[PDB]
Every structure is written in C-alpha cells, then in structure tokens.
Design an enzyme around this catalytic site. Structure first.
Site, PDB file in Angstrom:
ATOM      1  N   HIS A  64       0.983  -1.129  -0.062  1.00  0.00           N
ATOM      2  CA  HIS A  64      -0.001   0.032  -0.052  1.00  0.00           C
ATOM      3  C   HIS A  64       0.669   1.350  -0.021  1.00  0.00           C
ATOM      4  CE1 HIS A  64      -3.271  -2.859   1.884  1.00  0.00           C
ATOM      5  NE2 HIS A  64      -3.584  -2.281   0.937  1.00  0.00           N
ATOM      6  N   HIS A  89       5.845   7.167   5.852  1.00  0.00           N
ATOM      7  CA  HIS A  89       5.666   6.533   4.637  1.00  0.00           C
ATOM      8  C   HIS A  89       5.202   7.586   3.610  1.00  0.00           C
ATOM      9  CE1 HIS A  89       1.608   6.749   6.936  1.00  0.00           C
ATOM     10  NE2 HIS A  89       1.176   6.851   5.785  1.00  0.00           N
ATOM     11  N   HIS A  91       2.606   8.793  -0.006  1.00  0.00           N
ATOM     12  CA  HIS A  91       1.243   8.527  -0.605  1.00  0.00           C
ATOM     13  C   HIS A  91       1.588   9.481  -1.940  1.00  0.00           C
ATOM     14  CE1 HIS A  91      -1.141   7.008   2.634  1.00  0.00           C
ATOM     15  NE2 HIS A  91      -0.616   7.906   3.276  1.00  0.00           N
ATOM     16  N   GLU A 102      -2.566  13.673   0.125  1.00  0.00           N
ATOM     17  CA  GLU A 102      -3.912  13.103   0.487  1.00  0.00           C
ATOM     18  C   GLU A 102      -4.523  14.662   1.037  1.00  0.00           C
ATOM     19  OE1 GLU A 102      -3.340   9.838   3.540  1.00  0.00           O
ATOM     20  OE2 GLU A 102      -4.026   9.131   1.757  1.00  0.00           O
ATOM     21  N   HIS A 115       4.178  11.079   5.359  1.00  0.00           N
ATOM     22  CA  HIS A 115       3.475  11.039   6.913  1.00  0.00           C
ATOM     23  C   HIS A 115       4.482  10.675   7.811  1.00  0.00           C
ATOM     24  CE1 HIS A 115      -0.726  10.995   5.099  1.00  0.00           C
ATOM     25  NE2 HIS A 115      -0.352  12.162   5.031  1.00  0.00           N
ATOM     26  N   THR A 197      -5.676   7.451   7.449  1.00  0.00           N
ATOM     27  CA  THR A 197      -6.350   7.659   6.237  1.00  0.00           C
ATOM     28  C   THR A 197      -6.212   6.449   5.352  1.00  0.00           C
ATOM     29  OG1 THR A 197      -4.132   7.999   5.091  1.00  0.00           O
ATOM     30  CG2 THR A 197      -5.371  10.131   6.092  1.00  0.00           C
TER      31      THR A 197
END
Ligand SMILES: *[C@@H]1O[C@H](CO)[C@@H](O[C@@H]2O[C@H](CO)[C@@H](O[C@@H]3O[C@H](CO[C@H]4O[C@H](CO)[C@@H](O)[C@H](O)[C@@H]4O)[C@@H](O)[C@H](O[C@H]4O[C@H](CO)[C@@H](O)[C@H](O)[C@@H]4O)[C@@H]3O)[C@H](O)[C@H]2NC(C)=O)[C@H](O)[C@H]1NC(C)=O
Ligand SMILES: Nc1ccc(C(=O)c2ccc(-c3ccc(S(N)(=O)=O)cc3)cc2)cc1
Ligand SMILES: [Zn+2]
Length: 267
Positions: A64, A89, A91, A102, A115, A197
């Site tokens: 992910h 990590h 996104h 995000e 994040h 999230t």
C-alpha cells in the site's frame, strides 16, 4: 485485503471498516479562509531527527506504500503529550495524472505527501495500541511538490525503491537527517483532529499539516510514481494513486500556528 480501487476500494471501506464512514475523518481540504489562528500553538520541536539511531533503518514495501521504520528515541516536544516516532511512509499519484497528496490546502493537491507517524508513549506502549485511542497518534503531513533540483534528503529513501519493488520485500537504509525531509518554516502549520487515512480509519490522529511544501525533482517524482508494485509476484502491477479521497470537514475547526498580512483569517 483492502485496496484503494475496486470491490474492496476506498468507496467501500465503510462496508468492512465502520470508522471509515464516521464524521471526523482524514484527509481534508484545509481552506485558510476558515482556519482559526491559535497563538498558543507551540513550536513542534522534533527531537533526534538529525540522527535517527546508528543502526540501519528498515524500508518495507507493504503493498500500500513504502514504509521506513523509525526509532522511538525520536519524538516531538511541542505537543500535549510526548509523541515518539514509529515510522514514516508516502502517498503518491501516478505519472501523467494530477494530484497524489492526501491533504489539500485551498483546494489544491500536490504530487505526493509524506507522513511521519508518532504515538503517545506517556499513555501507551505501542503504536498499535495507541492507534485505537483518542489522540493516541500524532502524524506530521508534508505535502510534496516538484522543484528544479534533486532533493538529497528524499533521495536517501528513493534510491532504495528498486530494492523493494515487490510487496513485502524489505531493505536497509542508513540513518540520515530526517529534518531535511521537512519543509521550510516549521513554525507555520495547521492542526486538527482526524483519523488514519487507511483502514481501519480510527479517529485517533492529532494531525499537523505544514503550510510550506517540500520539493523533489521531476525525475525523483517519476521514480516514486512507478518503481514499486502492489503485487508480490508476476503478473506485476504498479503501486499508484495510493491516496485517500478528501473527507468532509464536518464542522471541525482547523487551527493555524501562524498568521500574516493578507491572511484569510484574523486574530
Ligand atoms: C481535539 O478534540 C479534543 C476532544 O474534543 C479536544 O480536547 C478538548 O479541548 C477543550 C478545549 O481546550 C477542553 O476544554 C477546555 O478545558 C479547559 C481546561 O483544560 C484542562 O482540563 C481539561 C479537563 O480535565 C483537560 O482536558 C486539559 O488537558 C487541561 O488540563 C477549560 O479551561 C476550558 O473552559 C473554558 O473554555 C470553554 C470553551 O471551550 C468555556 O465554555 C469555559 O467557560 C471556559 O472559559 C474548556 O472546558 C477539553 O477538556 C478537551 N477534551 C479532552 C478530552 O482533552 C482538542 O482540543 C481537539 N484538538 C483540536 C486541534 O481540535
Ligand atoms: N490489522 C491491523 C494491523 C495493524 C494495525 C495498526 O496497529 C496500525 C497502526 C497505524 C496505522 C496507520 C494507518 C494510516 C496512517 S496515516 N496514512 O493516516 O498516516 C498511519 C498509521 C495502521 C495500522 C491495526 C490493525
Ligand atoms: Zn499516510
């Protein structure tokens, strides 16, 4: 099991994870003409960021996102409780498409978002335990855009993506100055109550989203967008658009640790 798109995609998360459908979720669009200046918001005071231990850090592709384990010796000193680092990590979106972050500020998304996840060690003994509690976690959100030059700090992470292309693969990353992953003017940030999230979407996060953005080169962006796979083996599928859609503010207040001339809000 859960995914961003498909039968088990984010639009269906509430069907499997009740909290994903609650009303104090993240991410959100931070509209400055609606934020409230709080003169008492302290400087974040990240401790230990310059030297995250002396041992190699684990970098993991969990299918992910790509995640970097962090030592609990690192922590934030400007919050209601002592929040210790656990991991960070990313996104992102996908080459040829807009967005990727995000959170949004004034309805504008950027290409990616970092994040850095911490948990209240005063009250809890593990990230997992704290993850289900009110303000159990404190996450730092850094919106990432593209600049003209290569960002060395981010390169410390990006130079290792090719070693964990497949889901569940792991590799090691030598400690480096994590402070350089943060944007300029750390004293300018937004603070609000939100959630994870991703499923289970627990409403346990005290969010801090920086006003200024960090910049990586266009080449670094293309690498972040198409190196990792969401699969464990062939056929391979690129891990892309692993960002959650915006969630309603639902009358929550978003506070600003700063104010300036021409601000959409007053003191
Ligand atoms: C995220 O969501 C949480 C939970 O809703 C919010 O936490 C609450 O914040 C409010 C506002 O600060 C707190 O209420 C205020 O408490 C003050 C006393 O603070 C001490 O005591 C409380 C209770 O034990 C402790 O939680 C706190 O840590 C302190 O030790 C009072 O002085 C306030 O009263 C004054 O203001 C109110 C208006 O709000 C007036 O009506 C009163 O007359 C008076 O002038 C007020 O009661 C509340 O205690 C917090 N709850 C919890 C569980 O912590 C976060 O603020 C929120 N964060 C963000 C960023 O949105
Ligand atoms: N089956 C489970 C496995 C692990 C856990 C966790 O402990 C857990 C903790 C934090 C997180 C998490 C998710 C999202 C974010 S985010 N993207 O908002 O920064 C941070 C932490 C996920 C899982 C819960 C259930
Ligand atoms: Zn995240």
């Amino acid at each position: 099991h859960w995914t961003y798109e498909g039968p088990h995609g984010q639009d269906h998360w509430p069907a499997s994870y009740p909290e994903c459908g609650n009303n104090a979720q993240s991410p959100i669009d931070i509209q400055t003409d609606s934020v409230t200046f709080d003169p008492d918001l302290p400087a974040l005071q990240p401790h230990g960021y310059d030297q995250p231990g002396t041992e190699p850090l684990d970098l993991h592709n969990n299918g992910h996102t790509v995640q970097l384990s962090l030592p609990s010796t690192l922590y934030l000193g400007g919050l209601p409780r002592k929040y210790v680092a656990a991991q960070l990590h990313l996104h992102w979106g996908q080459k040829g498409s807009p967005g990727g972050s995000e959170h949004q500020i004034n309805s504008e998304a950027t290409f990616a978002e970092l994040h850095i996840v911490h948990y209240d060690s005063d009250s809890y003994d593990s990230l997992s335990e704290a993850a289900e509690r009110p303000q159990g976690l404190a996450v730092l959100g850094i919106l990432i855009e593209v600049g003209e030059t290569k960002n060395i700090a981010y390169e410390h992470i990006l130079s290792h993506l090719h070693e964990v292309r497949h889901k569940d693969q792991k590799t090691s990353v030598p400690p480096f100055n994590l402070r350089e992953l943060l944007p300029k003017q750390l004293g300018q940030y937004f603070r609000y109550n939100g959630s994870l999230t991703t499923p289970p979407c627990y409403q346990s996060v005290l969010w801090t989203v920086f006003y200024r953005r960090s910049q990586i080169s266009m080449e670094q962006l293309e690498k972040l967008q198409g190196t990792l796979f969401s699969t464990e083996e062939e056929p391979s599928k690129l891990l892309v658009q692993n960002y959650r859609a915006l969630q309603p503010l639902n009358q929550r207040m978003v506070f600003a640790s700063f104010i300036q001339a021409g601000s959409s809000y007053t003191t």
